[PDB]
Structure formats: C-alpha cells, structure tokens
Amino acid sequence: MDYHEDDKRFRREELCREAEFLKLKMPTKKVYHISETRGLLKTINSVLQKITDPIQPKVAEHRPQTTKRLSYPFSREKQHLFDLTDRDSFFDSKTRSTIVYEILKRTTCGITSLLANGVYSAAYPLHDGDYEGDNVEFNDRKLLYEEWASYGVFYKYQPIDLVRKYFGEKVGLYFAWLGAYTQMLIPASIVGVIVFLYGCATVDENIPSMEMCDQRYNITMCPLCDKTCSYWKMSSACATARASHLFDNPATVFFSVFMALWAATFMEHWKRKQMRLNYRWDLTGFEEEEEAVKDHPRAEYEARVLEKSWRDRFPAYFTNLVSIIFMIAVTFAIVLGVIIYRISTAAALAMNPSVRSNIRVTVTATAVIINLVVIILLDEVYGCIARWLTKIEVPKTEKSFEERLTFKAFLLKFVNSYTPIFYVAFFKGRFVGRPGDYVYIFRSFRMEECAPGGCLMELCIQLSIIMLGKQLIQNNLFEIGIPKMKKFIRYLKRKQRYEVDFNLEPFAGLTPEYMEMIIQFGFVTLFVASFPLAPLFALLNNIIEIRLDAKKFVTELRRPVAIRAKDIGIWYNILRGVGKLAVIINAFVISFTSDFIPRLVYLYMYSQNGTMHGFVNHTLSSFNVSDFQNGTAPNDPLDLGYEVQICRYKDYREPPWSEHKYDISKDFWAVLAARLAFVIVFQNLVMFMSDFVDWVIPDIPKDISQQIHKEKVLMVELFMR
Amino acid sequence: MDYHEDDKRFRREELCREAEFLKLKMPTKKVYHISETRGLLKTINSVLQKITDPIQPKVAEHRPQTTKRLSYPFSREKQHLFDLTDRDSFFDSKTRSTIVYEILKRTTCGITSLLANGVYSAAYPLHDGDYEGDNVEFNDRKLLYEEWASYGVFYKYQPIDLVRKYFGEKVGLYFAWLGAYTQMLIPASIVGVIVFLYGCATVDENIPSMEMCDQRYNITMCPLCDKTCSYWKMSSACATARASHLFDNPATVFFSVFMALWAATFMEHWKRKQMRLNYRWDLTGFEEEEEAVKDHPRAEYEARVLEKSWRDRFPAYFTNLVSIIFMIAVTFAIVLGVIIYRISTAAALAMNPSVRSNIRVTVTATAVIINLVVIILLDEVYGCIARWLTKIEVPKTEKSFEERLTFKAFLLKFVNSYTPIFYVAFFKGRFVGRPGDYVYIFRSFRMEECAPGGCLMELCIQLSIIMLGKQLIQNNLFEIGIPKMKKFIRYLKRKQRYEVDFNLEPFAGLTPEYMEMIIQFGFVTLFVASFPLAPLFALLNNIIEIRLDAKKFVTELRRPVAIRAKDIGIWYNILRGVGKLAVIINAFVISFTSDFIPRLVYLYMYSQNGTMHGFVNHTLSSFNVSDFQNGTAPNDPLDLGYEVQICRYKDYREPPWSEHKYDISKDFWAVLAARLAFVIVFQNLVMFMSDFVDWVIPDIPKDISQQIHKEKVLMVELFMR
Ligand SMILES: N#Cc1c(C(F)(F)F)cc(O)n2c1nc1ccccc12
Ligand SMILES: N#Cc1c(C(F)(F)F)cc(O)n2c1nc1ccccc12
Ligand SMILES: [Ca+2]
Ligand SMILES: [Ca+2]
Ligand SMILES: [Ca+2]
Ligand SMILES: [Ca+2]
Ligand SMILES: [Ca+2]
Ligand SMILES: [Ca+2]
C-alpha cells in the first residue's frame, strides 16, 4: 500500500526446523545493515525489507555511484561520485534496490547460497505500482505502459531514458539495441522491396523463364523418382521459374553486397550508439577482476579439493565436448530422418485420388511441421543440457558461467535453426548421379532431387515459412501465451503490493530475447542473396517484438534487480561473427544455388549471338531412356501424346550419341571454375569493403569525446576550487 | 667538458639583421624559464642551455611524470606522479632534455617555427660523453657501446632497459620490436631449413623430376622466342626441375600454413611484450586530443582563411590521389620497360661466341641490376614526393602528418618493392597464347615465356637476390657508408662537447628503419610458400641489423630528444594488414605458380595406376611445326640428330590430330577448378586458424594485470595513509 519497502524476502511457511533456523540467522547478521519487517501472511508468509537513509551513503560510497550534480553546462547535470546532495530522497527506487541487493549478496553467512539451498524461495524488489487503474498515483510504471508498452505506439520512439531509469542499464541497453536494429532494418527493407519490385517488373522479359514457359516446344524431363513418378514436361514448372526469377538476378547480387555493407554499417552505428548511451548513463568501466563474488559451487569444490589434499576440469571439458558433438550429430540425424520421411511418404501416398494430386504440398507441409515441432522440442532439451554442461564445468564466477552458457546455447540454437536451410541450399540435390547411375542412401532410398524449377524456390519457401509462421506467428504467440497459461494453471491449482508482485512471473533474463534477435539477424544476413524481403519480415517482427517485450516487462514479469551493464556483452561478438560468416554464405549461395553464374558463363562463352537465347537447351543434357538400371524407369509411362525415347536433365553431361556418353563434360568444369572464381572475388571484395566501412567510421563520435573532455575539465576545476 | 648543460641552440653566425633579432627575443621570453649561456665559438657560434632545479618540478608536474618511489614490493619501485623525492639530481639527463624540449616548444613567440624560419639552424641535447676512450668517466654511452652496440655481442640479449633509459621509450620500443622479431624468426628459420633439407633428401626420388631428367627419352619443346631461339630438348633443363622440386612439395605447403600461424603468433607475442614493456616503463595513456600543439603551417592557413572571410583540403586530396596514381603507373611502366628490355637484349645478343653461350644470365643479370638501381632512385624520389604530398594537405597536428606520410611512403615502397615479384609470380608467362597463335605487346614484341623449368625457379632466384644482394649487402653497406661519406664530404669542404655533437649527423627518425623491417617482413610472409629459407635470410639480416642500428645510434647520430611512445603506432596496423594479405598471396602462389595442384589433379583423376608416372607427358601438349604463323618458326632449326615435326609445350590444349586442335581442353578447366577450390579452402582455413590463434592468446598477460592491480591497491592504501 503505502511504505518505502525496498526488498522482499520470501520463504516456504512451515529438516524443516533446521531450514527455518537458517533464515533466522541471516536477518540477524544484517540487523545493523538493513531493518526488516515481518508480514504474517495467510498462504506462505512473506518478509519485508527496508534500507535506512544513513546506510545509503555507506553502501553507495563503497563503489563509485555517480549522481547528477548541480552544475549543468549545455543543460547537462554533472555526474560525480560524492560531491554534494540533499533532500534525503534523491535515490531512485531502482538504485535503492540495487544497493540493497549488494548488501544482501555481499553478506558472508550470501543470498544466492541460501536461495539455492531453498531456505528462501523468492526475493525481488517491488514495482512502483499498478500500470493500469482509475486515477492512480501516476507512477513511472503506468507512464511506461501508456507511452512505451502499448501496441498503439508502435510507430514512435521509445522512451529509452525512462526505461533505463525504471529497469536499469541492462534492459535499457537491450531495448536500445532492438530499436537501433529496427531503425537500420527500415532502409534495408525498403531496398529489398525495391529489388523485389524490379524482379517482378523484369520477370516478363526474362529469356530463360520465357524459354522454360514455352508450351510450343516439347521438352521431356527424366523422372525425379524411381517408379512413383514418370516423365514430366518442362513447361509444367513455368510458374516455378517465373517465381524463381524474382529471387535470382543482378539486383539480388547487388542486394547481397548492399546487405554486407549494411551489416558493417549497423555494427558501426551500434558501436557509436552504445558509446553515446554509456556517456549519457555511466562510463565507469573500472570493476574487480572477477574478485567481487565467487561461485558458491566453485567455493565448495575448492574446499573439497583442499580437504582432500585450475586444470582439474578436464573430465568436465571432455564431457562438454562429447555432449556438444552428440547434440550436433543428433540434429544432423534428425535432418536425415526428415529427408527419409519425405522419400517414403511421397512413394506411399502416390500408390493410393486427391492424395496423388497434392503429393508435393502434402509431403512438404507435413515434413515442415514435423521439423518445426521437433526442433522446438530440441531447442528446449538442448537449452536444458547446456544448463547442465555449464554447471558441471563449475565456472569460477557468475559472469563466466553466463558467458559460457550463452556461447553453448547460441551454438546449439544456430545448429538447430540453420541445419535444414543449409542442407536445402547446398547439399539437397547435389550429390545425386546421372539418370543411368543414381546414388542410394542405405542402398534402399534414392536420396533427393530438386523440385521442378530448382532448389532455389524450395529455399525461398522455407525461408518465408521460417520467418513468418515460426518467428512471427508461432514464436510471438507462444511468448504471449506461456505466461498466461502458467498463471491460469497456478490459479487452477486491496491486496498488498508484495503479494501481487509475488503472483507475477519471475524474471528469466535477457538471454532468450537476445537469442531470438540474433537468430533473426542471422536469417536476415546469411540468407539474403537468394531471398529479398527478409529485412522486411524482420522489420515487421521487430515492430511487434518491441511492444511485446515492453508489455511483458511492464505487466507480466517481476521487477528485475536492475544490475548495471555498459555493453551487450558476448552478443556483439556473436553478431560480428555471424556478419563475417554471412559473406561466405552469400557468396556460396550466389555461386552454387542461385543459377546466376551459369547464365553469365553461357552468355559470355557459349552464347555466340551474345544473348540469353538457348540457355535452357544448353543447361539440359539428353539421356537415353533405355539406359535405366533395371528398376529405375517409371512404373507407368504416362504417354500423353507420344512415347519418350530421350528424357532431358540438367547435369552438364555429354549426350548418349557421343563416345564418352554421360561423363562430365567440359562445360561442367568451366562452370565450376566460374563459380569458384566468383566465390573468391566476392568474398575478398566484400571483406575489403566491410573492413573499409569499419575503418572509415570512428568508433566513438567526436562530439561525445569532446563533451567528456569538457566535463572532465569542469570537474577538475570544481574539485580544485 | 664539465657542466650540466641540457640543450644546445645553434644559429648561423652573421635580412640578416632582422633574422638576428628573432633569436634575441626568444631567449629573453624564456629568461625566467631557462637560464642559458652564450658560447662565442670560432666557426658559426653556438648557445648553451641550462634548466634549474626548481623549474624541474614546475614542468615535470605540468603533466604526469611518473618516478620510481621508495616502496618496492617484489623488488619493484612504485612509479608515482609526485609523492616524495630528494637529492635534487634524481632526474635522468634524458628526462631533463625532454622537460627542456617541452619548455622550448610550448613557448608562444615555438622552437619548431623559428627552426623552420631558419633563425636557428640546429638544436639538440648532448650525449653523456664519448663511447670510446682511455679511462673515460664510465658513462652510459660507453656501456651501451661495449654491451649493446658491438658486433661481437650479436648473440646476447640487448640491454633494452638501458637503451630506453638513454634514448627514450621510442628507440627502446623499436629495438624491442626488432629483438622480438629476430627471436620469433629463429624457430621459423629452423623449420624452413628442415623443409629445405626434406626437399633436398626427396629430390632424388621425385618422379616428375626424374621423368624430366631422362635423356633416354626424346622430348622436343617449341622455341621460347620467334626466331632468336630454336627447338630445345626437355632434358636440357634437368637441373632446373631438380632445383625447383626443393621449393614446391607438400613440405612447402605445410611451411606456408606454419608461417601463417607463425605470423599470427608473432603478432600476439608482440602485443603481450608491448604490454609488458608499457607496464615496466609507462602506462599513462591519457593525452590531449590533438590539442597540445598545432601545426604552424596549419595555423597560418587558418589565419589566412579567417582574414579572407576542414573540407577546404579537397584540391590537395585530389592532387594527392592523382600523384599516387601517377607514381603507381610510372612504376608499372618501368616494369613494362624492363620486360621490353629483356626481349630486345636477348634477340640482339644472340645475333652476335661467348655472348650466345651466356644469353640467359647476361640478360637476366643486367636486367636485375638495372631494376634494382632504378627502384632505389624511385624510392628516393617517391619519398621526396610523399614528403611534398603530405605537406600540401596541411595536417592539423604533427602526429597526423607523420601518420599520413608513413602511410603514403609505405604504400609507395610496397609497390616499388613488390611489383616485379608479383609480375614474375603471376603474370609473367601466363597471358601468352598457343605456339600457332602468339600474343604480341605493341604488335612488335612477343611478350614473355617462362624459362625452361617453369617460372618458379625465376621467382626463387629473384627472391634470393633481393634478400641477399639488396636487403643484406647493398642496403647495409649503404647504411654504413652514407653517414661516413657525408662526414668525409663535410670535412673536405679537448674539443667542447657541444661542438663534437654538432659534428655528429642529425637524427632522421625511426621511419626508415621500420620501413626496412616491414618490407623484410612482407618478403618473409607474402612469398614463403614457393621459397623456404626466407626466414633464415631475414634472421641473418636482423642479426646484422640490430648491431648496425645500435652502432649508428651510439656513435654516428646526435642524441634524439627522446620523446615518449607506448606503441609502435601505424606499423602494427601495417604488419597486421601485410599478414592478412599474405594468406591470399600464399594461396595464389601455391595454386597457380607452384605446380602442386596439377600434380594432385593428375594423381587423383588421370593417374590410373595411382602413381605420378606420366605426369610430364600429361602436362605437355603436342604442336605441329607446320602451323607456325609465317615468321614465328625458328630461324635456324638446329637439327641435332633429326628434324622436328612436332614440338611439345605445356598449355593443356588438344593435339593437332583432333578436330578441335589447339583449343582449350577439359583438363585445363578441371585443373583451373582445382586451383580455385584450393585457393578458397586454403584462404578460409588459414584465416580461421589465424583468428583462432588470435582469440586463444590473451592480449595482456595475466601476470601484468594482477601486478597492476596489486600496485594500484598498494598505492591507494599509501595515498589514504
Ligand atoms: N520449409 C521447408 C523445406 C522445403 C520447402 F521450402 F520447400 F518447403 C523443402 C525441403 O526439401 N526441406 C524443407 N525443410 C527440410 C529439412 C530437412 C530436409 C529437407 C527439407
Ligand atoms: N631478380 C629477378 C628477375 C628474374 C630472375 F629471378 F630469374 F632472376 C626473372 C625475371 O623475369 N624478372 C626479374 N625481375 C623482373 C622485373 C620485371 C620483369 C621481369 C623480371
Ligand atoms: Ca518473438
Ligand atoms: Ca523476445
Ligand atoms: Ca571504426
Ligand atoms: Ca639494413
Ligand atoms: Ca635499419
Ligand atoms: Ca587475443
């Protein structure tokens, strides 16, 4: 109701008696530090905490606690450790909670140790009040709800200063990074939409697509499966080629280069914005060299080692390596099983009406749904096992534990999210053989063939499904519904502020949010040469996500402790690494799965006339149907208006009427050399461009540096006077 | 003789009267700062300078001047700004000279401005005394001469602390970097010698070299020139192939990878050593943001702009770009002229005894000598023009001027030093055509053909000549003789210390020394896949160079002002960039000029038997001598024991008895694809390995950080007590 209580100790109301004694001595050991009050609740009982005014300077002066001073050159209050202040209430409640948390966790007895032991089942600060109500006291929580956490203010700049003041520099840094990411995604989305519009405009005049779509010509392709399917006409995939043209053209290559430059520019812009926010909030980077607080399990391990009698973690490290390798192998095996799923389901379904008319979408849709559900469960399981792996290695400090767990979880999430996309982009229909000599996995299954029109369309469909159904629909819906579902379950199985805050969901951390954003960034950067509009989908998802996260923080979760951070941490390194890998991934996508290199090679060496006419005939090689290997020919030749004597396919192999029939032709080697040369040139040039963009743009803006120098001069002048 | 004089103003003894007045007011404006004495010399007159004891704390306290304090935990005197001291003589004479230089250059009137105007023709501090003599006072100069500057102490560690104390942190940092470079080059030299020994041992069992050396077989090669030369037997270049085998093999590829890793490790080791030296000497990185001293020409330009009425340097920038492009074009044109030199000289010489028996060495030796002399003169001219280019742009501060001049000079020196080597390695005999269709430069000259045995041997010979005759013999001899020559010229056209120091050569700077070392590093790293023993030659040159530079500093040059530096500066960035480019250069050398890829391709696709037999026949293509283009056949067919009907050559072209005779074969495209794939794989893997080496090794050693933390704790404890 009405008080100034600064923290909330919560314990299970009642060996049971032995555990009760532990919580009777900790408050006694902090009686002279913090004055508490006991609340005899009705359900589980709860304990209040209060910090007195004199204790504030004693603990606020233990470490440098900058506070805004009186002088304000250029309307900027000076931040000084301890110069002069008054009114005995200038501390923000977040700062009071942070000081109280320092007092609790610095005790010898530690709040973390007893929380782990289970004597205390909860501990949190309180919100300033209710975010919604009738004529409420006009707290900062309601201000954030109305001004920042509403879905109707999705277009306006977020009050980042108020967010940092209420929740701390950590959540504030996360939201500032999210806003900068969305703002940078805006122009990239515009350019991608322009590229897509250019492709749509040019699709009608595309010579290869027109040649593929010509129904006057009769081009018969070999079957994509042994006996389930038969010969198909090249014109049957006219829509696929026209759709594909919108995703591979010179505009797409230009957009890939533009997105590499955009990633570099976004990195530089985030560096500058982070420096600006540090100058605005706090620039005291001096901290203990991991000597502030030590991990209690680490302390117990050290005590055990000393009682018995670094580098003793080797069995843990080997276990971590083995577990990670096993996880990656399991993910690859699940991908292989999904591959085997599509082959068996397609063959069985065709043997059965409407089922044989929708074999493509029915097999692909069910496979996609199965993969998405399986990898959701895999993400949960791998997060838990990464928790365990980081626990067993026993990091010395909490910061190292968070660092290593974040690295492991990001690696596992990267593998699970990008394995099927990498497979479809590179290795889907590449390792098969000629129609007379196929390759079978487990000598029972023909592995995989690209859909009529190439595997680029499949990659585009997969990317669209992943970034719309999963990242935009399923993920956000799960985020909204999981806290509500758990609250409803808890309910199934006036009021004081501490009680209502206790009913709120505990804060989990910024790791899942950063993980989602980094995965989306990887989607935007790694796969953009073959798929424009990825920045547009990311922009829409981020527009929803800013308000979703703000609402979750304001209304659902408990108030975090609001510890200090000046950097996003390992996430910047992860972003830089993903951006660096995006250059190689984009180069390989353009060279091997884009079909752009073969068109250039044909135009500049085999065109003769100098145009693109005859490219489809050039890329298609003839095969004699009589050379099928006794059980691979179509079970029922359709015989639409003829009998197939020679079926066409695209492998760059010499014709049956040659001495070296079905062997790799010179055109294959020339096109492969062109692909490799383009990969080399693209990678080197894009890396040089990114390095140039990094080098030209200064890390710290000159204005911030000059303002810092002027502030230091003024502060030293005041100090000596 | 005997005094404590701390600086030496020197002026031309006598508008002349107007200039004399300028030097009469500067000492008056510093009478209260520095007490001078006038020396009425006999030749040109000279002025002494002295700084009093009270002025030392006034100027030493203007900026943080750390001095070793009394406390010494772990035998380490504490470095503090101003805590307590005594004896009134604890300042080193180098520190006294630095303080005096600060006093002189901070005056408004500035010593730099009047030195530029010409009123003062010289200004320097004095050496502690004579480095050699009979029962001399045992100064630090003689200690450095005996202990560090002698050629007989080439094997011992240099007294880097004494060098830094006498000459300052700048020369000390240069010499520490040189010593670390030599120490790192030692193991690399050992591994390279081992690789060379492996090649020498294996050369007898090399199947391709044995096949080339077989005199039983009769393989006739097409002439390498139109009419000057005739058909030659493949066995005539047996020595060339055997010598080449020592420079291209799996050991050479392993050594290229090892040298990439070694460059990364050397960068990390230098970073750690630099941090250690900073901790030992000075860690006060706080300095003015280019606000300490402004360039006098920049001030004059700003005053002119303000009187008339950033980004006004655009005509200067355009001039700089045009001049740099013109310089690079001139260097490339000189390379082209050297190319045209060899063609014309070879043809003319053969038309003439002994001349026709030594056409190869005579043409190549004279061409190499001409190129070396021309590029020496080019280096001098380009250094002067880079001086002018940096002057015209008017850098705001001296540090920016030095930075930009160093960048321009390094770029020009890189171009001049590496243009011929790059040409010989990549573009020498690559752009010629088939024997029936050659390509002529200016339609008068057949451009260039690789010597019998490949262009790898020519590259190895060029590298050996460059790193032995030029970098080791010519460069060191010129360094030793130029100061002696100038001193002898000055002489042709008891004594006080200032006079003898005046006779000494003025200090030029560390830029030429760093430039030589960086060029040698580029030689060691960029071209090492095709040439082992490069680290060995670099190690020998550095062993000579350490003592040569020490002797030059101790005995020849005047004592530098000994300004402070904590980093080598732009040279670290240049080294990192050269190392990064070395990966790509090594990959291209291995793939295109090493002949390693074709051997693998033949062994794994065309070998059949699985061995290397028949590789030489595979790489050689037949040509019908009747297809010469009417003036390209040999003028005099030698007819040793037969008449040539078909001459062989290596171009991967189909034989005359085929329908597509002389066209590019499938083997050419396959080998090109293999080369490009190897380039991609090598570049990516080596970049990842270098990044891993950088990431694993911490930049600052933990010992230095913990010692700094302990020192800070002790200092704060003493400060509060
Ligand atoms: N989404 C999606 C997928 C699509 C398509 F985009 F067209 F719908 C096609 C496809 O072959 N695969 C997809 N996911 C896969 C996972 C493992 C193996 C193959 C996989
Ligand atoms: N040194 C050296 C050179 C050698 C060799 F090593 F064999 F001696 C061979 C060679 O063709 N060239 C050399 N320098 C060149 C500069 C420009 C053009 C060609 C050049
Ligand atoms: Ca989401
Ligand atoms: Ca989220
Ligand atoms: Ca930068
Ligand atoms: Ca030298
Ligand atoms: Ca030198
Ligand atoms: Ca490092």
Ligand nearest to the CA of B336: 2
- Alpha-carbon gap, residue A332 to A412, rounded angstroms: 12
- Using an 8 Å Cβ cutoff, are A52 and A35 in contact? yes
Q: What is the CA radius of gyration of chain A?
A: 32
Task: Show Cβ contacts of residue A209 under 8 Å, excluding neighbours closer than 6 positions.
Answer: A203, A238, A241, A242, A244, A245
If you count them, how many residues does chain A have? 721
Q: Is the CB of B102 under 6 A from ligand 2?
A: no
In this structure, what DSSP letter does residue A656 have? T
A110-115 own/partner pairs: CB under 8 Å, 24+ apart: A110/A293, A110/A296, A112/A296, A113/A296, A114/A22, A114/A23, A114/A26
What's the CA angle centered on A527, arms A521 and A529, to 5 degrees? Answer: 125
Residue of A nearest to B290 (CA): A706
Q: How many angstroms separate the CA atoms of A651 and B466, rounded? A: 50
Q: Residues A510, A516, A520, A522: is their CA dihedral positive or negative?
A: positive
Q: Which residues of A touch B584 (CB under 8 A)?
A: 684
The enclosing H or E element of A695 equals helix A666-696
Apex A625 CA angle, A621 and A627, nearest 5 = 95
Q: Phi first, then psi: what are they for B472, rounded to 5°?
A: -100, -40
Alpha-carbon distance of B560 to B553, in angstroms, equals 9
Breaks in chain A at C–N > 2.5 Å: after which residues? 14, 109, 309, 352, 493
Tell me the CA–centroid distance for residue A467 and ligand 3, in Å.
11
Q: Note the residue count of chain B.
A: 721
d(CA B126, CA B561): 10
**DSSP letter for each residue of B393-429:** H--SSHHHHHHHHHHHHHHHHHHHHHHHHHIIIIISS
Q: Is residue B449 part of a domain?
A: no
SS3 B557: strand
B177: in domain: no
Instruction: Give the closest of B670, B680, B709 to A669, CB-based.
Output: B670
The DSSP element (H or E) to which A67 belongs, if any, is strand A67-68
Min distance B679 CA to chain A CA atoms (Å): 8
| Inter-chain CB proximity B679 and A684 less than 8 Å | no
Residues of chain B with Cβ-Cβ distance to A289 below 8 Å are: 705-706, 709
State the DSSP code for B664.
B
CA count, 13 A, side-chain hemisphere, A55: 20
- Cβ-Cβ contacts under 8 Å, B669 against chain A: 666, 669-670, 672-673
* Rounded (5°) CA angle A202-A529-A223: 75
Q: Whose CA is closest to B97, among B171, B25, B165? A: B165
Ligand 3 centroid to A516 CA: how many Å?
7
Neighbours of ion ligand 3 (CB under 5 A): A 475-476
Structure tokens at A591: 């060279």
> Which helix or strand (DSSP H or E) is residue B440 part of?
strand B440-441
**Nearest residue to A719 via CA among A60, A87, A64, A84:** A84
Among A225, A334, A366, A371, name the best residue to mutate to test ligand 1's pocket (greatest count of ligand atoms within 8 A of Cβ): A371
Domain assignment present for residue A328? The answer is: no
Spatial CB neighbours of A124, under 8 Å, sequence gap ≥ 6? A7, A8, A10, A501, A502, A506, A558, A559, A561
According to the annotation, is B545 in a ligand binding site? yes
C-beta neighbour count of B529 within 10 angstroms:
28
B578/chain A closest Cα distance in angstroms = 14
How distant is the Cα of A596 from the closest Cα of chain B, in angstroms? 18
Only one residue has tokens 């530098």, namely B560
Q: Which atom of ligand 1 is nearest to the CA of A365?
A: 8
Decide if B683 touches A, using CB distance below 8 A: yes
User: Which has the closest alpha carbon to A58: A18, A111, A102?
Assistant: A102
- From CA A280, how far away is CA B569, in angstroms rounded? 31
Q: B705 and chain A: CB distance < 8 Å anywhere?
A: yes
**C-beta separation of A605 from A181 below 8 A:** no
* Category of B431 on φ-ψ map: left (φ > 0), alpha (ψ -120 to 50) or beta: alpha
Q: Cβ of B155: how many Cβ atoms within 10 Å? A: 6
Cβ contacts below 8 Å, chain A against chain B, sum to: 38
End-to-end CA distance of chain A: 46
Closest CA to B49 of B103, B130, B106: B103
| DSSP state letter for A237 | G
CA A325, A327, A331, A333 dihedral sign is positive
Domain assignment present for residue A475? The answer is no
Residue B691's φ and ψ, nearest 5 degrees, are: -65, -40
| CB B558 within 8 Å of CB B564 | no
Q: Would you tell me how many other CB atoms lie within 10 Å of the CB of residue B134?
A: 5
Q: Using an 8 Å Cβ cutoff, are A578 and A260 in contact?
A: no
CB B532 less than 6 A from any atom of ligand 2: no
Residue A335: closest CA among A419, A418, A256: A419
* 3-class secondary-structure state, position A288: coil
Distance CA B178, CA B183 (A): 9
What is d(CA A154, CA A147) in angstroms, rounded to the nearest whole number? 10
Can you tell me the distance from the alpha carbon of B419 to that of B567, in angstroms, rounded to the nearest whole number?
Answer: 30
Q: Is residue B476 annotated as involved in ligand binding?
A: yes
Give the CA angle between residues B663, B664, B665 to the nearest 5°: 110
- Residue B423 in contact with ligand 2 by CB distance below 6 A: yes
Concatenated DSSP letters for A124-160?
A: E---SS-SS-SS----HHHHHHHHTS-GGGTTSPP-H
Among the partner-chain residues B666, B706, B709, the one whose CB lies closest to the CB of A669 is B666
Beta carbons within 10 angstroms of residue A307's beta carbon = 7
Among all bound ligands, the one having the nearest atom to the CA of B416 is: 2
Task: Locate the chain A residue with the closest alpha carbon to B684.
Answer: A584
The amino acid occupying position A294 is K
Cα A689–A693–A698 angle (5° rounding)?
Answer: 160
**Cβ neighbourhood burial of A506 (10 Å; 0-12, 13-18, 19+):** exposed
Tokens for A51, please give them: 């910090």
Distance (Å, rounded) from C-alpha A550 to C-alpha A556?
A: 10
Query: What crossing angle do the helices spanning B666-696 and A666-696 adopt, rounded to 10°?
Result: 30
B651 marked among binding-site residues: no
Contact status of B325 with chain A (Cβ, < 8 Å): no
CB B616 within 8 Å of CB B637: no
Q: What is the CA radius of gyration of chain B?
A: 32
A513 CA distance to ligand 4 middle (Å):
4
Question: Domain of A13?
Answer: 7-125
Among residues A270, A277, A264, the alpha carbon closest in space to that of A178 is found at: A270
With a 6 Å cutoff on the Cβ, whether B371 touches ligand 2 is yes
**The token pair that represents B627 in the structure block:** 């297809």
Experimentally, how was this structure solved?
cryo-EM
Task: Please indicate whether, in this complex, the C-beta atoms of A669 and B673 are within 8 angstroms of each other.
Answer: yes
Q: Which residue has the tokens 């193991």?
A: B187
From the CA of A140, how far away is ligand 5's center (Å)?
37
Q: What's the Cα-to-Cα distance from B587 to each of A229, B454, B457, B592, rounded to whole Å?
A: 47, 18, 18, 8
Three-state DSSP class for residue B606 = helix
CA A663 distance to own-chain centroid: 44
In a domain? residue A553: no
What is the domain count for chain B?
A: 1
Q: Are A526 and A574 in contact (CB under 8 A)?
A: no
Q: What amino acid occupies position A706?
A: Q
Q: For A527-550, what is the HEC assignment?
A: CCCCCCCHHHHHHHHHHHHHHHHH
Separation of B473 CA from ligand 6 center, angstroms?
A: 8
DSSP assignment letter at A605: I
Q: Which of A340, A369, A462 to mutate to test the pocket of ligand 1 (most atoms within 8 A of CB)?
A: A462
Q: Tokens 């004699």: give the residue.
A: A624
With contact defined as beta carbons under 8 Å apart, do B358 and B345 qualify?
Answer: no
> Measured between CB atoms, does A676 come within 8 Å of chain B?
yes
**Counting Cβ atoms within 10 Å, is residue B584 exposed (0-12), middle (13-18) or buried (19+)?**
middle
3-state SS, residue B509: coil
What is the distance between the alpha carbons of residues B93 and B336, in angstroms, rounded to a whole number? Answer: 54
Do A74 and A715 touch, CB atoms closer than 8 A?
A: no
HSE at residue B90, side-chain half, CA atoms within 13 A, is 13
Are B253 and B529 in contact, with CB atoms under 8 Å apart? yes
CA distances from B563 to A581, A608, B510 (A): 43, 69, 12
Q: Which one-letter DSSP state was computed for residue B363?
A: H
Q: Is residue A30 part of a domain?
A: yes
Contacts of B673 in chain A (CB under 8 A): 669, 672-673, 676
Burial environment of residue B642 by CB neighbours within 10 A (0 to 12, 13 to 18, 19 or more): exposed
Q: What phi, psi does A301 have (nearest 5°)?
A: -65, -45
Query: How many CB atoms are closer than 10 A to CB B481?
Result: 11
- Token digits of residue B529: 């896949």
CA of B262 to the centre of ligand 8 (A): 14
Alpha-carbon distances, residue B403 vs A22, B412, B482, B570, B571 (angstroms): 65, 14, 26, 7, 10
Helices (H), A352-397: 354-357, 359-393
Distance of alpha carbon B572 from the chain centroid: 12
Given a contact cutoff of 8 angstroms between Cβ atoms, the answer to whether B222 and B623 are in contact is: yes
- Count of C-beta atoms within a 10 Å radius of residue B46: 20
CB contact under 8 A, B705 and A677: no
